[PDB]
Design an enzyme around this catalytic site. Sequence first.
Site, PDB file in Angstrom:
ATOM      1  N   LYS A  24       0.821  -1.211   0.000  1.00 17.77           N
ATOM      2  CA  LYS A  24       0.000   0.000   0.000  1.00 17.77           C
ATOM      3  C   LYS A  24       0.864   1.274   0.000  1.00 17.77           C
ATOM      4  O   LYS A  24       0.370   2.378  -0.253  1.00 17.77           O
ATOM      5  CB  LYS A  24      -0.992  -0.016   1.173  1.00 17.77           C
ATOM      6  CG  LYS A  24      -2.141  -1.036   1.009  1.00 17.77           C
ATOM      7  CD  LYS A  24      -2.881  -1.276   2.322  1.00 17.77           C
ATOM      8  CE  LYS A  24      -4.006  -2.321   2.215  1.00 17.77           C
ATOM      9  NZ  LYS A  24      -5.173  -1.826   1.384  1.00 17.77           N
ATOM     10  N   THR A  59     -11.577  -0.272  -1.796  1.00 15.11           N
ATOM     11  CA  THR A  59     -12.954   0.214  -1.627  1.00 15.11           C
ATOM     12  C   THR A  59     -12.963   1.563  -0.922  1.00 15.11           C
ATOM     13  O   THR A  59     -13.888   2.360  -1.111  1.00 15.11           O
ATOM     14  CB  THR A  59     -13.859  -0.770  -0.858  1.00 15.11           C
ATOM     15  OG1 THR A  59     -13.244  -1.105   0.388  1.00 15.11           O
ATOM     16  CG2 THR A  59     -14.116  -2.031  -1.674  1.00 15.11           C
TER      17      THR A  59
HETATM   18  O1  LIG Z   1      -6.648 -10.861   3.094  1.00 18.06           O
HETATM   19  C1  LIG Z   1      -7.143  -9.975   2.408  1.00 18.06           C
HETATM   20  C2  LIG Z   1      -7.109 -10.050   1.014  1.00 18.06           C
HETATM   21  C3  LIG Z   1      -7.681  -9.010   0.276  1.00 18.06           C
HETATM   22  N1  LIG Z   1      -8.280  -7.907   0.920  1.00 18.06           N
HETATM   23  C4  LIG Z   1      -8.893  -6.790   0.153  1.00 18.06           C
HETATM   24  O2  LIG Z   1     -10.212  -7.175  -0.310  1.00 18.06           O
HETATM   25  C5  LIG Z   1     -10.912  -5.998  -0.795  1.00 18.06           C
HETATM   26  C6  LIG Z   1     -12.345  -6.423  -1.140  1.00 18.06           C
HETATM   27  O3  LIG Z   1     -12.338  -7.240  -2.310  1.00 18.06           O
HETATM   28  C7  LIG Z   1     -10.186  -5.328  -1.991  1.00 18.06           C
HETATM   29  O4  LIG Z   1     -10.844  -4.100  -2.331  1.00 18.06           O
HETATM   30  C8  LIG Z   1      -8.702  -5.063  -1.689  1.00 18.06           C
HETATM   31  O5  LIG Z   1      -8.020  -4.731  -2.897  1.00 18.06           O
HETATM   32  C9  LIG Z   1      -8.046  -6.302  -1.043  1.00 18.06           C
HETATM   33  O6  LIG Z   1      -6.700  -6.024  -0.631  1.00 18.06           O
HETATM   34  C10 LIG Z   1      -8.323  -7.849   2.314  1.00 18.06           C
HETATM   35  O7  LIG Z   1      -8.850  -6.886   2.881  1.00 18.06           O
HETATM   36  N2  LIG Z   1      -7.748  -8.889   3.053  1.00 18.06           N
END
Ligand SMILES: O=c1ccn([C@@H]2O[C@H](CO)[C@@H](O)[C@H](O)[C@H]2O)c(=O)[nH]1
Lengths: 810, 810
Positions: A548, A650
């Site tokens: 990030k 998001t």
């Molecule tokens: O372990 C994880 C893997 C992915 N994401 C996030 O999911 C979101 C919802 O799909 C995405 O917007 C984001 O890019 C992703 O890092 C998480 O928050 N935790």
Amino acid sequence: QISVRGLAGVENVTELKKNFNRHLHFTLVKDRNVATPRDYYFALAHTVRDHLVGRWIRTQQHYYEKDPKRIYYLSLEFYMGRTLQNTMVNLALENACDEATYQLGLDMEELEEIEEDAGLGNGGLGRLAACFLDSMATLGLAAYGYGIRYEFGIFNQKICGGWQMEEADDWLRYGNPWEKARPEFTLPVHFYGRVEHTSQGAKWVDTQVVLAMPYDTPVPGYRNNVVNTMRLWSAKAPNDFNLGYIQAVLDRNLAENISRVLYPNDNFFEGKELRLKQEYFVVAATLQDIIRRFKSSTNFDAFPDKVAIQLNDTHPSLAIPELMRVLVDLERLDWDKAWEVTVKTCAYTNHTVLPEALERWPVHLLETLLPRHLQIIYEINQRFLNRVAAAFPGDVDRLRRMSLVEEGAVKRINMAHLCIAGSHAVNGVARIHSEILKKTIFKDFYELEPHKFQNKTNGITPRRWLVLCNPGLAEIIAERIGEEYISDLDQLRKLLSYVDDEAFIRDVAKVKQENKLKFAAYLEREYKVHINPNSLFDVQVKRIHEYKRQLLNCLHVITLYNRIKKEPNKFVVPRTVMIGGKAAPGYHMAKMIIKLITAIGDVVNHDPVVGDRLRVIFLENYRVSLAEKVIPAADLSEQISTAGTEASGTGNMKFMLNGALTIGTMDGANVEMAEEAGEENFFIFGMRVEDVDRLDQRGYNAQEYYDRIPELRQIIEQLSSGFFSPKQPDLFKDIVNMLMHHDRFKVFADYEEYVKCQERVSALYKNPREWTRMVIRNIATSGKFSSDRTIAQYAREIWGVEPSRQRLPA
Amino acid sequence: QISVRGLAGVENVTELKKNFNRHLHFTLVKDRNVATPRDYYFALAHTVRDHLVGRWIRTQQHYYEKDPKRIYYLSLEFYMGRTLQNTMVNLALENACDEATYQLGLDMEELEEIEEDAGLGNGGLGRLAACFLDSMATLGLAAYGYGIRYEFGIFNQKICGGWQMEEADDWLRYGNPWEKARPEFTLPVHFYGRVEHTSQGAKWVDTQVVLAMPYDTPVPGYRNNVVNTMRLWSAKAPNDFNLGYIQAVLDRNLAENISRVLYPNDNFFEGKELRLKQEYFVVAATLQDIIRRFKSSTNFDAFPDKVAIQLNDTHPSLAIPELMRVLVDLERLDWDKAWEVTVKTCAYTNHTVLPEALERWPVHLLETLLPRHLQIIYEINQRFLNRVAAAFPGDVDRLRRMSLVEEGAVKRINMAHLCIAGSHAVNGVARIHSEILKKTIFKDFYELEPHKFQNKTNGITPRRWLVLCNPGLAEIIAERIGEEYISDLDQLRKLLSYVDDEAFIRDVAKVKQENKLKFAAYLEREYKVHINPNSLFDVQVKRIHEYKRQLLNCLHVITLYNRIKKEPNKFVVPRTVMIGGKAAPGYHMAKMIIKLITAIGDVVNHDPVVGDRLRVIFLENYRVSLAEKVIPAADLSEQISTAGTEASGTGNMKFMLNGALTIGTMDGANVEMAEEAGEENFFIFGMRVEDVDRLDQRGYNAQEYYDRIPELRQIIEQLSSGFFSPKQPDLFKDIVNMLMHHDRFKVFADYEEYVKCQERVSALYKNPREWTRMVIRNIATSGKFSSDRTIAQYAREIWGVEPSRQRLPA
Ligand SMILES: O=c1ccn([C@@H]2O[C@H](CO)[C@@H](O)[C@H](O)[C@H]2O)c(=O)[nH]1
Ligand SMILES: O=c1ccn([C@@H]2O[C@H](CO)[C@@H](O)[C@H](O)[C@H]2O)c(=O)[nH]1
């Protein structure tokens, strides 16, 4: 006060007041003379809750009568936040409750601040599940969220000496008025044991039993009288458990630890046994519940016509072999039929391409904990690889690449491979991400079964993320185009015809200024920090991770400081740089990044030469309730992940909807956001995915950038010499070493373009009128990013059901 | 239906019905189509609860306004049983609820059976606390019960293969509608640490903190609108507890284990650390609460005028050094003043003279867990022994006998000695017991401070133990003498003028027959056992202990069987012998006694020659709710402890009140019972205390009895040879060995007189009219044994407060 918050009509206000007083007396056992603000919160919460139950009971009886196809959303995370205001908004009760409480001599906003967040998630994946539940109810789908009722959610973050400290999130201490325990629907879950082969199939015997007790929470749709259910399982020991005596009773804790605490890892796989137990626990209890409900409508041919199971990442992937187990071992279906049913029932959503985040469970763990499931997984793999061999004869490396079983020092099961094999649909969460899946990590699978692969670009609910958190903006929008946009966000396009409207320009800029003042006041009252509300609010809020690139933001901050110190009497656009987010307790680099941010603040915020021109603040304890505060206050949204790493994002969408401009890479949903608004109206910079690939092939050499960029060299020298840590000169040596020698995310490669782009942001901010006009062009084109759109696509393209905006009878 | 159950008047019935439906809908979130009997129970419970809260709030505000002296009853046990019917009775709601539920199409008795017992006690000591709370509320005292909210109460007893099996009493599984959590009043409790001496006194530092969270339960008085509070503490870990991450959260369990489970020992001291923690936990949290309430009325001279603390046995004995600690270390009072206040505040009730039951804590445990308290105990001891030395100069053995510190292999603190030293009043629980205390175990203390020693003969509440469990008897009594006896049990004497009343004789015998039929039906429905309702119901229900001599009862049963087998065609009065009660999980002999009882049943109940003339049944899972069933059904009450061992007994009183005649030794309250009714109207047998003493001096030789009593010899030979265990011939060798060689309780010595006395019982039972007339003479003279009398005596003679029967405004 404002129109979007509903009617406050005499009859309702009087009835709310009396029910408030009834709950205070009978439910809380208090009188007005001993009651505290917390008691008042609970009396209000119970009063609003009463309005849900009638609709809740009739929604569930409606589903029984009509028998629609049911959607089961399986997730280990539901990042819900606070429930009170959301419930009022969706029931059109906000103004009435506001009036009722005012007449009782209470401030409702003060009461709203007493509610604990339901912090049952880590970040984006957990919040997505919560937005999805809201949208499914709003679109009238017969949907159920299934997960774990963690006793402790994501830890509370304290900052001490600039360092992150963790404390237990005891969110249930004062009780949860929203949930209803359902001990009557308790179900057994099996662990360990061994497999026995008889004349009539396999049998899983000598198991340890843990009980799963459900707690139901209502999920109200937006003003449609639909109330769906989120069912969360809690672990309970059986009463004959270990049944010297005292020890046996105390040992019940071991079984009940299953639902004790949320694992705080985000985008990182930790192969711990307790996590595996959590994953099976949710899956085993949920599937029994599904099958029970299906039988109470013999013939499982109709199962996929009446049931859809959506797997949120691979966390609930054991649903696939568990469904097979139940169908084959218990219902006595033949393998081929059971497999057909399983595949047609299950669908899988991938949320990341980071290799360290993929779940790869050691065979020896599954062997001991779930011996029958391992047998089923092996059989699935054998049959799947026979299909691959038949499609691509003699391609032996493809066979090893596609296998569900990974060979090596320790044998592992690739849970992502299991999910693809056993699902009729596999989706990514933004167009670029879904393409990356087909071109890289799941290329072999795409070549075998192209029809399985889809895209479903993520969204956010405009209820929580506009109406609730930004009533000022929702109101000025409603004045021009009406209220229908709240459940049809595409209508925001109508705002493009107001981009040259002098009244609207002034109102948009006014709402932002008010939000910034309100948030500046929050910081003083709750954290005793001082900020200039006239400055550009530059914010990056999200979990702390190397991908990030909070570090890239840090480098820019230091560049600004160094430039000021070099030419003090030169004018610069004043900034308040705000960075917040939690680090996983064992993620050392992420913890060091937090310390760096606070350390920069300690130097920058106290330099007399800087004045009020530059401030760096670390936002403590970032969580849903804090997001609802800072996002409406932001001018600039930092979405600066290395291209190809953020699957979607998001938080980006939340900022766009709330009147912030975006500085970002062409990554995740940023691409589609820029496409919707127009690239002229976004601050895009840096490498594209193709550029990252080119750099990897050549080899990334960070020293090159250090050698050729004097401003970057100065920063590294400052970090190394102890400029930002005078008492511990080598405090940040690990950070410098990583940046110089093993940076997976190419921070240096985007530095020049980033700083240049930031200069263009500052330039536009000097022209308030043109800044605001660009803002209006963003808000107006944010429609695509409603989770109502996302869920409509899942419904039509994966689940095979039609959404409905039609009201149920009140 | 019956007059004693209150009015069912139109207005009330309609209002109860609507509130029932409201709770079913809003509180339980159910409709009539999915509701189960359990849902209906909870809807009723919540409806009745509503009627309490108004009175609860106004009682507590009344105490605030009037500021009376407060009574604090400290106990580790509150054996409450079920609450629903008791609440209805005390609020005069029973007939109204009965009517309201009938009109809803429900059977209230069926609903009442769904409630779990609050089994937060072991037996007599725990039940006494519950009767006391009822009486204190009925007598309008500002009284509070303070204890621990155990997650698991006394274990549920299952009988498997004739053996006791234990299972966890998960009494909170479905929730507790009666309690109100009070997380706002949470208090810290300290453990471990070390003592630091400064210029300004001692300081207890580096402690581990456990939080005490209170749960309040209302205690309604009998129709006086008084509702007192029972406050039970629950253990909670602090949020920074052990704050790798996951383990730290899971380790919170260690702190919270303090309130997890009730120790199941009755009349036996187990020196376990967790038990000590429980004892301090209740004491530390309670005393802070007391002092807080006292300050909210600086000068502690008035403390004893406003506070009384009653210690239920030595379990809360740490109240004495804890009060000293707070007054000396925290409030900075001088020692002598603090001691004066402590002594005038505390009073101690002793419940047993059995040496194995006395709490003697190892110094090394107190040193580690409570280092400051040990220091205070040593200082108390030093000053106390200086008083002894001054009163009895040169009496060096008296000094060692009276010391709070016991020397030996391990040094111990005698908690009973601590209690006497630090209390202004010490009482036994029946006249004979209180005399034994002064003459034997506390003789030295009585000689030093005779004024401290009192008697307070135990009682039972006539609400639970007559009106609630025996409405048939309460009604026929009310017909003749009115309803006032329920709160003035002495009025039962008026029934003596009905002893020759042919109508009353018939009605008394009718109520008993109906009770016996109802209980015979319960046994079939719930346990599939068959009994003859025409037989004499011979019952012994109480915890299993050697001193209680269930074995003597067993010997009689076998004697009856052997006599039948010898002369089969001879007439005998038919008996149903019922024995019930729990054994502590680690009490081997008690577990063997249960097995013996079931083994006798297995032989006796299936002998065709016996027929329906003799039955032996072990009553499974004896507890408060079962007592309410079997006691009204009994004809003969077995109270056959060795003289000098049962301090009082309270089960004895329950049987007397409910129309059973008593066979018993001159032990505990049996003496006063026989005195009240007349010895002609009791079946007294066996050694008196003086006879036991004579036998001890001479030496008890069991072989003598074996040699001279042929019927006893036969039984021992049957036990030894395997007559009652054909597959395991030596199963009862431990029992025989104990009886023959090391019987502390002289079973053989009372055998002859016991059997003879039982023959006299059978003789009287052959004459129904004269049996019943003797019964009437018992019920009529049972008045003294109301806990209202007992509590009135505590109030006047110990606490220095006046009871009141005056109503509070509704
Ligand atoms: O372990 C994880 C893997 C992915 N994401 C996030 O999911 C979101 C919802 O799909 C995405 O917007 C984001 O890019 C992703 O890092 C998480 O928050 N935790
Ligand atoms: O550990 C103990 C010690 C004594 N008692 C009983 O207390 C009752 C109430 O005072 C008495 O009636 C009974 O005799 C005694 O054994 C217990 O129930 N448990």
